[model samples]
Target: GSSGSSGRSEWQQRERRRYKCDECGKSFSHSSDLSKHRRTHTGEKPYKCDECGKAFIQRSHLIGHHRVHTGSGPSSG
Candidate 1:
């Protein structure tokens, strides 16, 4: 509350959207990417496959894995 700076340096304040992982301390521009990265360490799979019931951390990975069951090429969507 003291002054307008909030104690962070000018450069630090500029990176407001920077998201850091608590486990590995890695940084990402988006919070969602950081969430997916954290799953790598925690082994948490929130995205589930409807076909084989497999789980994945990222949706892109899940989509790719889903192709294995559908036997279709990757889609642009």
Candidate 2:
């Protein structure tokens, strides 16, 4: 056992959480990306718009759809 170089820090190394895809062997950095990616693969939409009760892959998708309901921007109500 020879002690030569101790240059590495052991504080929270490799803290990345792996939310892997089993469908296509894809990997996502974020859980949302992972779950959202599932929507693209097989699981499909869970985010439903209250206005139309329509399903979308993500909340941002619904947000974009909301634009149609609030045609001139944010609704007064």
Candidate 3:
């Protein structure tokens, strides 16, 4: 057999996974999750670090870059 469907997993029922990603097929109710997801889709690297001048789609990643500058970590709070 040959795999044709890329990420089209049809087994998922809509009752559980409501917001299946329009493209990536991610599904969850955490509204804030899309905040980061949005940037992933937009592909905009507006947050760049001064340390390396590299680009990042998510601000969270920018913080990680900051850590490389001096010393820091991530924030779940």
Candidate 4:
């Protein structure tokens, strides 16, 4: 619920918070998101599978992959 000019100026100010990674030069709106992307360069898989001994970089991805091994994975129906 912002006026046109006020919204424009606010957007411009917020735009300054956006940043590009130094390693791959990918852009992100949040620094935490960029930090997560940076982990890929290090090959860091912090999330480990409790059933098998596999690891993943992201927790949500690890959980999703685990579902596949447990027969509860997502299916196209």
- Give the worst 10-residue stretch by lDDT in candidate 1: 7-16
What are the models' TM-scores? Answer: 0.33, 0.33, 0.32, 0.30
lDDT of 2 by residue, 1-77 (tens): 67875543343345213567655777777777787776776665745555676778666887678766533222234
Which residue pairs overlap in candidate 1's backbone? none
Give candidate 2 regions above 4 Å deviation: 1-17, 44-77
RMSD values for the candidates in order, in angstroms, are: 19.2, 19.4, 15.5, 17.4
User: Which residue pairs clash in candidate 3?
Assistant: none
lDDT for model 3 comes to 0.55
lDDT of each: 0.59, 0.61, 0.55, 0.56
- Flag regions of model 3 displaced more than 4 Å: 1-44, 71-77
- Comparison by lDDT, 1 against 3, better one: 1
> What does the lDDT read for residue 32 in candidate 1?
73
Q: How would you encode candidate 4's per-residue C-alpha lDDT over 1-77 as one tens digit per residue?
A: 65453222221122222456545668888767776786777545544454676767776887578655533323344
Q: Tell me the tens digit of each residue's lDDT in model 1 across 1-77.
A: 55563432223123223467555668888767777787888766645554686667677997568557634333344
1-77: candidate 3 lDDT, tens digit per residue: 67674643344333324334444667667756754674677655544444576768786887556656543233344
Clashes of 3: 0
Which portions of model 4 miss their true places by more than 4 Å?
Answer: 1-18, 43-77
For candidate 1, what is the total of clashing residue pairs?
A: 0
